[PDB]
């Protein structure tokens, strides 16, 4: 691949939201970048993302 940030390989990133009480299973025989940290989310209302230099 063309170099990006001096690399020729790539790491693709994936995600999922695990519902309360469920189980996530990871099986692999190579090429895994394992989760180390994960986030327990709490949702609210009225928030959003803005782009600003203020």
């Amino acid at each position: 691949r063309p170099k990006v940030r001096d690399q020729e390989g790539r790491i693709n990133y994936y995600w999922t939201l695990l519902e309360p009480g469920d189980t996530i299973i990871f099986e692999a025989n190579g090429n895994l970048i394992a989760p180390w940290y994960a986030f327990a989310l709490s949702r609210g209302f009225g928030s959003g993302i803005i782009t600003s230099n203020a």
Binding site: G46, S47, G48, I49, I50
Partner: protein, 171 residues
């Protein structure tokens, strides 16, 4: 406006009147000056205040809404998102500007009628005891002291009481 009072039968307003919107000016042997018609002014204020607040209060709060990111293969959806925002902006801009213009015209007619109606109220009180002159004034044919001026303003003028004097002064 369509009633013809503002800069019509009334040459222009009074910078010397400070206690209201509509009112009277008088002159007699005991003095002169300006005084507002508090009943007419307050009703005009309440009407307008309700109108302004209706335009504002009936509007809903703009709730959080931001744009959305789309990737390079989602241009059709990005363009739909934009179409929705542009369409809503065009509708609200057109309506906001046109509403204000239509209501400003009506407010000025509202005021034009209110002062004209005040003029007619006095004309009906005075009948033949005064004559109409320009600038929205009634020139009395009898002596009208301060008690008389208050009586005319309050709509309690005792017309026949002054009729003998005016008949003589009218020649």
């Amino acid at each position: 406006g369509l009633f013809g009072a503002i800069a019509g039968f009334i040459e222009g307003g009074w910078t010397g009147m400070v206690d209201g919107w509509y009112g009277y000016h008088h002159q007699n042997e005991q003095g002169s000056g300006y005084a507002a018609d508090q009943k007419s002014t307050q009703n005009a204020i309440n009407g307008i205040t309700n109108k302004v607040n209706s335009v504002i209060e009936k509007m809903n709060t703009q709730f959080t809404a931001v744009g959305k990111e789309f990737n390079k293969l989602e241009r059709r959806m990005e363009n739909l998102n934009k179409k929705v925002d542009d369409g809503f902006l065009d509708i609200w801009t057109y309506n906001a500007e046109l509403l204000v213009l239509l209501e400003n015209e009506r407010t000025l007619d509202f005021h034009d009628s209110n002062v004209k109606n005040l003029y007619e109220k006095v004309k009906s009180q005075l009948k033949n005891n005064a004559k109409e002159i320009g600038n929205g004034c009634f020139e009395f044919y009898h002596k009208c002291n301060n008690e008389c001026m208050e009586s005319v303003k309050n709509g309690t003028y005792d017309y026949p009481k002054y009729s003998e004097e005016s008949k003589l002064n009218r020649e």
